[PDB]
């Protein structure tokens, strides 16, 4: 018998849909708790500890992990990030000098978090000129609903939520355009996988192939009422939201996964270690890091 925790995360992407008809348990035949965490910093944590086995993260959590040499690695990608992550502001801020002297929130060492960074330093602006705070999605929610914050750069629920009454400042999309690119990732720890490579294989097909049929025709994929409702229920977001949600990053086929794993993710992370190094944010960063990438499980 086989026991397995996943750390999953509420991005609103088509994976999802294998995670609510429970694909990954009934491939493997594992038994599979699903864990959600509200950012990749406690799922570094929880694979640390061995209480999770399998976690999705972010670049930014990914490249502290691999730099604090936690036995973990990317053997799949989820997406590659773009407006699905936000940064969304009280609709007084226009322009990015607007930023100075205000209020904002982050989950910390996010993939948020290194954008925040990413587009401030953009615009010629020094991170200490704002007040960035570090706060979870749902306490972002709630802080924003109380006026204690300006703004935050968040994905759902929580981007979705603040947009509503909130204005688009930048995006992922953009921040990746500016030389700043995000991903999120599957990893998994290395005596799981050395005990269980089965379900490792298992579960990254689970995700490859419930993105496929959205990677072939996204218009048709996003016209099946099981496709929205599942991902509505998993991102906790209003089905009305779940297509501009979707359409926020962009997934691989199985040629792409593969060709990112032998060595543009190394290079991806080699790069994110350095931003976070240059704003202060981990002590050192290897000049190589292809210990955290396999292509072996796809």
Same mark, same amino acid.
């Given at each position: 018998?086989?026991?397995?925790?996943?750390?999953?995360?509420?991005?609103?992407?088509?994976?999802? &849909?294998?995670?609510?008809?429970?694909?990954?348990? %009934?491939?493997?035949?594992? +038994?599979?708790?699903?864990?959600?965490?509200?950012?990749?910093?406690? #799922?570094?944590?929880?694979?640390? $500890?061995?209480? &999770?086995? #399998?976690?999705?993260?972010? /670049?930014?959590?990914?490249?502290?992990?691999?730099?604090?040499? &936690?036995?973990?690695?990317?053997?799949?990608?989820? $997406?590659?990030?773009?407006? $699905?992550?936000?940064? &969304?502001?009280?609709?007084?801020?226009?322009?990015?000098?607007?930023?100075?002297?205000?209020?904002? =929130?982050? *989950?910390? #060492?996010? +993939?948020?978090?290194?954008?925040?960074?990413?587009?401030?330093?953009?615009?010629?602006?020094?991170?200490?000129?704002?007040? #960035?705070?570090?706060?979870? *999605?749902?306490?972002?929610?709630?802080?924003?609903?109380?006026?204690?914050?300006?703004?935050?750069?968040?994905?759902?629920?929580?981007?979705?939520?603040?947009?509503?009454?909130?204005?688009?400042?930048?995006?992922?999309?953009?921040?990746?355009?500016?030389?700043?690119?995000?991903?999120?990732?599957?990893?998994?720890?290395?005596?799981?996988?050395?005990?269980?490579?089965?379900?490792?294989?298992?579960?990254?097909?689970?995700?490859?192939?419930?993105?496929?049929?959205?990677?072939? !025709?996204?218009?048709?994929?996003?016209?099946?009422?099981? !496709?929205?409702?599942?991902?509505?229920?998993? /991102?906790?977001?209003?089905?009305?939201?779940? *297509?501009?949600?979707?359409?926020? !990053?962009?997934?691989?086929?199985?040629?792409?996964?593969?060709?990112?794993?032998?060595? *543009?993710?190394?290079?991806?992370?080699?790069? +994110?270690?350095?931003?976070? %190094?240059?704003?202060?944010?981990?002590?050192?960063? =290897?000049?190589?890091?292809?210990?955290?990438? +396999? /292509?072996?499980?796809?």
């Amino acid at each position: 018998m086989v026991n397995v925790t996943v750390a999953y995360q509420t991005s609103a992407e088509p994976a999802k &849909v294998a995670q609510a008809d429970n694909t990954f348990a %009934k491939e493997s035949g594992a +038994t599979v708790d699903w864990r959600k965490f509200d950012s990749g910093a406690s #799922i570094v944590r929880a694979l640390a $500890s061995g209480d &999770v086995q #399998i976690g999705n993260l972010g /670049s930014s959590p990914l490249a502290v992990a691999a730099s604090q040499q &936690v036995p973990i690695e990317v053997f799949l990608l989820a $997406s590659k990030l773009g407006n $699905s992550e936000a940064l &969304v502001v009280k609709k007084t801020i226009s322009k990015p000098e607007d930023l100075i002297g205000k209020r904002i =929130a982050v *989950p910390f #060492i996010s +993939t948020t978090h290194y954008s925040l960074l990413a587009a401030l330093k953009h615009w010629g602006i020094k991170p200490g000129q704002v007040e #960035i705070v570090n706060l979870q *999605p749902p306490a972002i929610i709630a802080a924003w609903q109380r006026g204690d914050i300006d703004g935050a750069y968040v994905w759902a629920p929580a981007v979705n939520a603040l947009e509503k009454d909130g204005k688009v400042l930048t995006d992922s999309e953009q921040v990746g355009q500016w030389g700043a690119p995000t991903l999120d990732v599957w990893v998994v720890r290395k005596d799981f996988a050395e005990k269980h490579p089965e379900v490792v294989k298992a579960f990254a097909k689970s995700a490859i192939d419930a993105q496929q049929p959205y990677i072939a !025709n996204p218009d048709v994929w996003l016209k099946q009422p099981e !496709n929205i409702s599942k991902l509505a229920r998993l /991102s906790g977001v209003p089905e009305g939201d779940v *297509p501009g949600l979707v359409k926020g !990053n962009t997934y691989l086929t199985p040629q792409q996964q593969t060709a990112e794993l032998t060595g *543009p993710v190394n290079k991806a992370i080699i790069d +994110t270690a350095q931003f976070l %190094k240059e704003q202060g944010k981990v002590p050192a960063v =290897a000049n190589d890091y292809s210990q955290y990438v +396999t /292509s072996r499980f796809v």
